[PDB]
Amino acid sequence: GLGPLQIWQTDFTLEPRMAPRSWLAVTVDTASSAIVVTQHGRVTSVAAQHHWATAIAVLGRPKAIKTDNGSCFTSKSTREWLARWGIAHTTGIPGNSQGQAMVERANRLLKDKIRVLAEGDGFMKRIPTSKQGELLAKAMYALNHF
Amino acid sequence: GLGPLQIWQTDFTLEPRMAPRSWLAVTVDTASSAIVVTQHGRVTSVAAQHHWATAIAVLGRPKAIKTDNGSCFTSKSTREWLARWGIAHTTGIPGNSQGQAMVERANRLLKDKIRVLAEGDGFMKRIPTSKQGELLAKAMYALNHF
């Protein structure tokens, strides 16, 4: 077809309202603008692979994934994981000055939606650990479906 | 449009290879045949709402959901959760003799795929707790995407 190329942009971003699993892994599929987000306790190579396992289940396997040069994305372990799946990986140009403003915008929209929803439910600070999962799933829903 | 009506079928099914969170909540969206599955430690009203929160995030909100009369689906708590989302709910006819063979077939396909994938990875009995999540996401992927 002449349709979009299946390229994802992935990034992690800190959200203290979701502590203790405050690191949010966010993937924007650039062909559809669909967002996938998962929560993690630490920013490591394995949290990035667990996030991509879930995004693959939800959006299918991409042709390539663009990330920055965080070490969780360029370690040995993460390059071998992406090679086992046959997914090409680029961190773009060095000083590329971000060829990944989609996931950057997605991160701000996501944090804002989480703040609005949680305050609507009366949580002005950290969201109680047991309510976190349904709220994060409600923020993902709101940003993806109309 | 003249397209399918957005109706889901949901059910729980036991999978000891995924112990201790061996209860699998599985939703088949009947318009697309897409499957959503999440893992749980117990079969309760809250595990059913946590599962539907995730399926809503992944497939959008449905118009109705068909389930059997398990108590986790007909309790007060679960009917109020579905009423907060504005999702209609039916358990079909009493002696309906299952107007939900889609999710029933989906359950068998799912368990078979989990067995094949895990044995391909050398796990002939229970899958090690730390490998469970990526394998369940790999089974979901295999049943949804081509």
The method of structure determination was X-ray
CB distance B145–A60 less than 8 Å?
yes
Residues of B with CB under 8 A from a CB of A: 49-50, 53-54, 56-58, 60-61, 133-134, 137-138, 140-141, 144-145
Resolution in A: 2.2
Instruction: For residue A121, say whether it is annotated as part of any ligand binding site.
Output: no
Instruction: For residue A80, say whether it is annotated as part of any ligand binding site.
Output: no
Query: Across the interface, which of A49, A61, A137 has its CB nearest the CB of B56?
Result: A137
Amino acid at A119: E
Domains of chain A in sequence order: 1-146 (3.30.420.10)
Separation of alpha carbons A29 and A39, rounded Å: 18
Residue with tokens 């190329």: A5
For residue A131, CA distances in Å to A108, A113, A127, B46, B53 come to 21, 15, 7, 11, 11
CB distance B141–A56 less than 8 Å?
yes
CB distance B133–A53 less than 8 Å?
yes
Measured between CA atoms, the residue of chain A closest to residue B51 is A134
Burial class (CB in 10 A: 0-12, 13-18, 19+), B32: exposed
Separation of alpha carbons A53 and A41, rounded Å: 17
For residues B123 and B27, the answer to whether their CB atoms sit within 8 Å is no
Measured torsion, CA atoms of residues A18, B37, B145, A103, in degrees rounded to the nearest 10: -10
CB distance A53–B145 less than 8 Å?
no
Amino acid at B51: H
For residue B145, CA distances in Å to B17, B29, B55, B86, B102 come to 23, 14, 16, 29, 18
Query: Across the interface, which of A50, A137, A144 has its CB nearest the CB of B54?
Result: A137
In chain B, at which residue ranges do the beta strands (DSSP E only) sit? 7-14, 23-29, 34-40, 64-66, 88-90
Query: Across the interface, which of B57, B60, B141 has its CB nearest the CB of A57?
Result: B141
Q: Which residues of A touch B60 (CB under 8 A)?
A: 141, 144-145
CB distance B134–A58 less than 8 Å?
no
List residues bridging with B38 in a β-sheet. B25
For residues B128 and A44, the answer to whether their CB atoms sit within 8 Å is no
Instruction: For residue A112, say whether it is annotated as part of any ligand binding site.
Output: no
| End-to-end Cα, chain B, rounded Å | 26
Measured between CA atoms, the residue of chain B closest to residue A48 is B134
